[PDB]
């Protein structure tokens, strides 16, 4: 019921870039853009939380065909103007150092998709993930941890929960439970979706709050650089509390290795109940409340 692979790697759709949008404003590092597809005259659904997958043209530097990259929705079911007709992307511009053969390296897909203009014809297969998903349950708690692109799902849960057009639409979910957004980036003009995400938070103070990690702009208690495991550690109680709900989910998104002091800060709050956390967080991911997707 969860739709999944409508389309494949053989037989990909053909989508049309609509915009690519910036969402690093001037001052901030590197170059993440907000890419919207047509999604008309195919049958392609999706719901929040699931990837889809692009396929790049060109060849590796072994003459083979480039294979798929995997891209987190940004847009909930309904698309950004709520109409079922597109499908939006989050997607940063991958490169790296000079020290690295040819140095200076640029991603293929992503330096393929940042640099994309209106008009052009993509591949695209998918949807794929089951992994991600959101209850249908308007009284559950979310709890959404994100590091940079990772904030794509946390975006398509948010929107369904609080976009008055999406409220519109979605008769049978009204949320009204609590969701809490830690989200880490390097600085202030890096937030990505700022605007829309604080203008939620003024609308639903008693259901959402906002937290950000600005690790060239915030100092932790140990005189390093604030990113999300150390707001983590400093909230680690009253989030420990929020996860002993039944009704609690846990989202977390973003790149590789921030997984690891999220569970340390847990840890330390669990032990105080005589709880092992990484029993009770098995226990979590089998019941279907603990989600990860990191890369
Ligand atoms: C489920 C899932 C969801 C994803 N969602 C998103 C999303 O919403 N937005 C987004 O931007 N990305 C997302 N990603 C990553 C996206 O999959 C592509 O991997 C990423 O964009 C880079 O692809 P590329 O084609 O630009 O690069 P490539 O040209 O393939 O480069 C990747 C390779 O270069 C190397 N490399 C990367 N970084 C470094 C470094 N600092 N130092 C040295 N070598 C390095 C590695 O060998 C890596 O295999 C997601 C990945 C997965 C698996």
């Avoid at 979910?173 to 980036?185: A, D, E, H």
Wanted: charged letters at 25%.
């Amino acid at each position: 019921d969860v739709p999944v692979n409508l389309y494949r790697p053989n037989a990909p759709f053909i989508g049309k870039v609509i915009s690519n949008e910036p969402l690093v404003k001037e001052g901030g590092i590197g170059i993440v853009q907000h890419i919207k597809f047509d999604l008309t005259g195919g049958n392609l659904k999706y719901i929040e939380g699931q990837s889809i997958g692009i396929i790049p043209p060109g060849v590796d530097k072994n003459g083979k065909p480039e294979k798929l990259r995997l891209y987190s929705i940004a847009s909930t079911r309904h698309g950004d103007d709520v109409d079922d007709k597109t499908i939006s992307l989050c997607v940063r511009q991958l490169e790296y150092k000079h020290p690295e053969s040819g140095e200076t390296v640029y991603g293929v897909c992503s330096t393929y998709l940042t640099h994309i203009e209106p008009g052009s014809e993509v591949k695209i297969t998918g949807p794929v993930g089951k992994e991600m998903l959101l209850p249908d349950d308007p009284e559950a708690n979310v709890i959404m941890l994100a590091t940079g692109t990772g904030i794509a799902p946390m975006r398509t849960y948010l929107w369904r929960m609080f976009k008055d057009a999406e409220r519109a639409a979605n008769p049978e979910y009204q949320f009204k439970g609590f969701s809490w957004l830690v989200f880490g980036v390097p600085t202030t003009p890096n937030i990505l979706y700022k605007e829309e995400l604080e203008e939620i938070q003024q609308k639903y103070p008693d259901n959402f709050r906002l937290t950000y990690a600005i690790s060239r702009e915030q100092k932790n208690p140990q005189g390093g650089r604030m990113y999300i495991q150390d707001r983590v550690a400093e909230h680690a109680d009253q989030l420990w509390q929020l996860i002993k709900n039944q009704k609690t989910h846990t989202y977390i998104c973003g790149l590789e290795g921030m997984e690891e002091g999220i569970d340390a800060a847990l840890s330390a709050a669990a032990a105080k109940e005589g709880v092992t956390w990484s029993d009770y967080q098995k226990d979590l991911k089998k019941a279907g409340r603990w989600h990860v997707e990191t890369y």
